Design a protein around this ligand. Structure first.
Ligand SMILES: Nc1nc2c(ncn2[C@@H]2O[C@@H]3COP(=O)(O)O[C@H]4[C@@H](O)[C@H](n5cnc6c(=O)[nH]c(N)nc65)O[C@@H]4COP(=O)(O)O[C@H]3[C@H]2O)c(=O)[nH]1
Ligand SMILES: Nc1nc2c(ncn2[C@@H]2O[C@@H]3COP(=O)(O)O[C@H]4[C@@H](O)[C@H](n5cnc6c(=O)[nH]c(N)nc65)O[C@@H]4COP(=O)(O)O[C@H]3[C@H]2O)c(=O)[nH]1
Lengths: 217, 216
């Protein structure tokens, strides 16, 4: 429906998902389609993807190897879409949540539907549904001048590889990188191919988008 | 009681609880949710013996939890009915026979109206099986066939096969060393290598495995 909010839920399709989809569409002015993380890469360049206004991210189906796929999907098709996490672990580390650049709300593995509908309805009115502590962490962090939280994959790279990535995620060219590290152009090309694991970049654009969101000062 | 004691093997999450609510509100049953990975903790609880139905969520199932399942079923609720949900449309019928009390299958794309319709037929002691699936049962069992040999079995070495096959007849350690003319501590050492592949925490799991996985 043209009237409704275009929402895309990253999860399995199954009895439960479809039940959830039904439950949401019943009580809120939104049109939800389900797309598994594994299939995200196929939606990246579809025209209808550009119309998503909200991603419902099912944390209980998330994994490190789908993350690069997510980041390039977000940036390519719907960078302005809000993001909402469901099934978040209670004991989750606040800074791990900061990678969701448009995080609008978090719903926890043991939240009931009363809560999901109450929160979702507030998000749809452009409110946030964040916990007090979580809110406080944002403020502390950001207000104190910090932005990106450097991920774990990065810290697992060799020195050459780190240096080469840092630059990439500043938008440097291959040749630009070569010249800053005093190295052959094909040299850096060869490191990047190694770096496309486990960052998991199917290509350069991906990695470059990975870098911008995953490696910070 | 007054309600059927149903246990659903699945993740706990928004969706699962939604499903549980949806089920409990349309049928006379009391559902609790227990994740596969956590099944071994429930194996020896008193309340596990009260389970009358297992709703097995195929989408959350893997081979490493299977031997955990078969020992749980047999120790705690061998007579409980089994009902599969989120089954792949294209699943190979023979693979389904390992559920000794299968009563119903629900497929990845079945809607709730179908879930409620079948569950009610099951609660009336009817089955919710596809025409072909029913047919495959008859063809197979009618022709006197029994356990379908797993893929895990076919993967281990002839030595290990021979030793397992005998275990899955209920032979002793020494009885096995003696049929294969081998050292008693030799068979013990193969079993350990097998328990790893099979995923048996112990010998009991192992032999409950062989019974359900290594006919004929
Ligand atoms: N009277 C009052 N109490 C407050 C307020 N803020 C926090 N609390 C208390 O602190 C508990 C946990 O807050 P939370 O971690 O932010 O976690 C909250 C928050 O994440 C969400 N939530 C509940 N209601 C609202 C709401 O009206 N607005 C927003 N933005 N979030 C809410 O649900 C979670 C648990 O809700 P509770 O069971 O109510 O549990 C709340 C409530 O007992 C407040 O402004 N007024
Ligand atoms: N009028 C009639 N048509 C039959 C009969 N048996 C099978 N069909 C036709 O065959 C289709 C697929 O059969 P199925 O694999 O058993 O697959 C069926 C079966 O697994 C289940 N189902 C539907 N209704 C019933 C029911 O009343 N009893 C049982 N036991 N299963 C049902 O849902 C699946 C899809 O159902 P359908 O959309 O109806 O699609 C059914 C229906 O079009 C029958 O006895 N009478």
């Amino acid at each position: 429906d043209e009237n409704k909010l275009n929402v895309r839920m990253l999860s399995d399709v199954c009895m439960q998902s479809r039940l959830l989809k039904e439950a949401l569409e019943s009580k809120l002015p939104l049109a939800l389609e389900i797309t598994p993380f594994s299939e995200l890469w196929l939606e990246e360049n579809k025209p209808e993807s550009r119309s998503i206004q909200m991603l419902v991210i099912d944390y209980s189906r998330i994994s490190d190897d789908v993350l690069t796929d997510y980041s390039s999907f977000k940036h390519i098709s719907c960078p302005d879409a809000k993001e909402v996490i469901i099934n978040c672990p209670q004991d989750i580390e606040h800074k791990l949540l900061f990678k969701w650049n448009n995080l609008a709300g978090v719903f926890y593995i043991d939240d009931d539907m009363d809560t999901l509908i109450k929160g979702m309805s507030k998000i749809l009115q452009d409110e946030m549904w964040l916990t007090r502590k979580l809110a406080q962490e944002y403020i502390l962090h950001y207000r104190a001048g910090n932005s990106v939280v450097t991920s774990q994959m990065y810290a697992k790279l060799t020195k050459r590889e780190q240096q080469i990535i840092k630059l990439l995620g500043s938008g440097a060219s291959n040749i630009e990188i070569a010249d800053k590290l005093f190295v052959s152009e094909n040299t850096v090309k060869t490191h990047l191919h190694n770096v496309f694991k486990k960052i998991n970049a199917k290509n350069r654009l991906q990695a470059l988008i990975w870098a911008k969101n995953n490696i910070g000062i």
